[PDB]
Nucleic acid binder design. Sequence first.
DNA 1: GCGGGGGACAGCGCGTACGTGCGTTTAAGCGGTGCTAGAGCTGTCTACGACCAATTGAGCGGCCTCGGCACCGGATTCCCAAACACA
Length: 73
Amino acid sequence: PPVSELITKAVAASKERSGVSLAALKKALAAAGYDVEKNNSRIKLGLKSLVSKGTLVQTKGTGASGSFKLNKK
DNA sequence: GCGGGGGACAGCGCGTACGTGCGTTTAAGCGGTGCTAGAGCTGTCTACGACCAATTGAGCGGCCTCGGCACCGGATTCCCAAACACA
């Protein structure tokens, strides 16, 4: 399954008012059996694609270093 | 021993400052010349310090006193850490 679903599912499972950090996303995908080490660069890209698709709102920071929430709009 | 909160450490981004490279300029390095100030050595003779015996008073041990400082309690003050006021 593509990493955009795994990320969206992790952000939905940890839904809050702040927003899953990249470190929490790493932890959730690793707990989901996804190798976050080798494919970290893929994650940053896929995450960026999800922000560029507007599917994730950046709530703090800039780019992948930030916190993110599912764009309910 | 325990609760917790701040700091250490991890991850990311970015932007500019440092490394690499190239061409030009500059002055370091080398050699060579010349000059003279001063370092190094020597002889003299003289004032200056070591040595010694005698004198003595300055300093050291021993005693004694009191005041400066330590201590205690009581009152004063000074940050602090919430804490709510209020925009």
